[PDB]
Design a protein around this ligand. Structure first.
Ligand SMILES: O=C(O)COc1cccc([C@H]2OC(=O)C(O)=C2c2ccc(Br)cc2)c1
Lengths: 254, 259
């Protein structure tokens, strides 16, 4: 029966490449060796915007992160709709799985762009450092540090795009999202996704023992930082006197 | 097969210490919850009257919470005894044995508490009593919602149909976690958890053969345990600042100390 598990592994990987432009393999090449722009202080921030083409002082960084998250949701939605059985679910269930899922996949693939010294920005064309992300006014000065502590641990598992492709699918098909209407089949697809993930990590990582069990424990983490960032997204709602400009622009970021 | 036999010896050793460390197991709790015995029948507490009459074995809202933390201290004592029997735990650094226990005990307590709970209430007083879920939820604020997260997780967790032999290994995996803040020597802990995870995977393969992917579905429940600890922690901070005379316990207040 593992013939179908190997089929599903490459089907999800091929769709992973089409839905996501900047893959982990191409981000690892940029982080080590061609070079992009480096934003390390306040001068290189303004210097960046000139020759980088952004699409939007301390709030300009956060608003750009929400612009990138909106583009990410579209890539995650298109990728999820290619998972076998996803589009054949209840349309309300598909909306719910994506609603409570995109935040966890955003940080999983964000780690693919992070090391211990910074993160890539604007499709690998730039690079914001770690210390510059702790030198902003509150509460911006400490909303990326939990995500850097997580990216260090998660990337230590040292997975590739084919492992991540299956791992992304399992997070979307989580059958415990509040408000589901047909919890059965969602757990059915996630059951075969977990089999394909268990098989994938054995054939690609034969030396690392219980990489499948250690990967599932990172989900326990993942949600703890998603629910922590959610409660931080309402500190920006109540603080800063510059987080409400064009009303049509507020509707996009929901 | 010779290496899988080494994992069976580990599984039987953990189950042996489990029986010897926790007096009330899930096997005995299910014999009490389901009314199949004429001798292990509990006195049900459902209102104020059944409370004062069942006082032979056990402010109302405060008195209920005092006994909850009294049993929590009883639980930590049993968890520490069982952790010492896990192979390698006592061989680690003494600072790490305290940190693995500091963040691990509550995730263990809510796991085994689910063995004493059905959808209608919780076993209390060593199985002699049974406090209803409605009465626990009918307590005044902020105590009227102190138990619903525990109950909602139990009916979800008990669906896995795990017995004490599977629970023994899953308890050991939670204690020997490398993801806990303050671990000085992380790698020697990850080696022990790797051995416990191999034993748990084989245990569920043999004890639950028809149940597919029970190993992955069980490891996902650790995400539920974290949110209960965080919601619990948030709730004590409100009680500490409202009931100013409400005093804790050396075992509990030092676990919540900058958790
Ligand atoms: O004392 C009162 O009137 C109300 O407080 C009570 C009432 C009943 C039982 C107890 C405690 O004693 C025990 O043996 C026991 O397990 C207690 C207990 C406390 C909280 C939860 Br949850 C489960 C059990 C305290």
């Amino acid at each position: 029966e593992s013939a179908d598990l190997r089929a599903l592994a490459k089907h999800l990987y091929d769709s992973y490449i089409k839905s996501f432009p900047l893959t982990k393999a191409k981000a690892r090449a940029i982080l080590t060796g061609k070079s992009p722009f480096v934003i390390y202080d306040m001068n290189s921030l303004m210097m960046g915007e000139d020759k980088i083409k952004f699409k939007h002082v301390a709030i300009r960084i956060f608003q750009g992160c929400q612009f990138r998250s909106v583009e990410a949701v579209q890539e995650i939605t298109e990728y999820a709709k290619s998972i076998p059985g996803f589009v054949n679910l209840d349309l309300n269930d598909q909306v719910t799985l994506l609603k409570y899922g995109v935040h966890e996949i955003i940080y999983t693939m964000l780690a693919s762009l992070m090391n211990k010294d910074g993160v890539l920005i604007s499709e690998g064309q730039g690079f914001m450092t770690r210390e510059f992300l702790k030198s902003l006014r509150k509460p911006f000065g400490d909303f990326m540090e939990p995500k850097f502590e997580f990216a260090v641990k998660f990337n230590a598992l040292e997975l590739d795009d084919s492992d991540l492709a299956i791992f992304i699918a399992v997070i979307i098909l989580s059958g415990d999202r509040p408000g589901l209407l047909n919890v059965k089949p969602i757990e059915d697809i996630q059951d075969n996704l977990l089999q394909a993930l268990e098989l994938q990590l054995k054939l690609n990582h034969p030396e690392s023992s219980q990489l499948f069990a250690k990967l599932l424990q990172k989900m326990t983490d993942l949600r703890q930082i998603v629910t922590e960032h959610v409660q931080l997204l309402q500190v920006i709602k109540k603080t800063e006197t510059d987080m409400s400009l064009h009303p049509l622009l507020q509707e996009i970021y929901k």
